[PDB]
């Protein structure tokens with residue numbers, strides 16, 4: 436039996452549901468693939484190096500979560516696909532001995548969104564997830580505003596044509612997107628009354644954290660604002676990553692059916 440190794444790098448990382456859904460696919464598709472993948476959570480120290488670790492472990496591919504997506508973009512050997520315009524990599528593959536980066540978050544997010552004609556969006560956060568979502572919503576022709584805590588992240592969002600604010604714009608937004616790490620600290624990403632003001636006019640409150648009711652989502656729910664957590668996105672982007680891990684032999688829709696059900 437040929438064995439290939441995979442994992443997800445993050446910090447923190449023990450709560451990730453990738454290993455479950457990817458290992459289910461490796462099992463299911465092992466015959467088509469002619470190898471058995473095995474996928475593990477990898478707590479990467481902040482001060483380690485994603486490329487060095489990838490090579491040291493002998494992986495054939497990896498996912499990349501918080502706080503590593505921008506770094507992964509900087510350290511990859513080659514960047515392919517929409518990753519180029521996201522400034523973020525969530526998917527690594529060893530191709531012809533080169534470490535190649537992809538980003539499956541953009542199109543995962545897109546596929547998670549039922550409603551096709553929101554007009555504008557406010558994105559909170561400036562990590563790799565925020566970057567991919569801005570890239571993706573701009574491509575769809577929404578007006579995108581971005582609010583974060585400092586001037587870090589600015590040049591990226593401005594070159595994409597996003598309106599970057601340094602105080603909360605006093606404007607209604609269709610989509611309110613929490614792409615901060617706040618739900619992890621069990622916190623709001625923004626002042627409560629400010630959030631309330633958005634929620635009262637908004638049409639969807641969208642949090643990236645999956646499975647659990649974050650303070651961001653619980654505020655939206657209390658205000659009767661429609662809300663959505665990261666669970667459909669996580670599944671779509673996993674399936675797209677799997678399609679890369681398979682060398683484009685297993686189409687993401689085949690993976691998505693297995694992953695959804697196991698999830």
Ligand SMILES: O=C(O)C1=C[C@@H](O)[C@@H](O)[C@H](O)C1
Nearest residue numbers: 443451452453498499500525
């Ligand atoms: O929690 C997880 O395992 C993941 C979260 C997202 O950021 C994805 O970009 C990542 O590839 C997998």
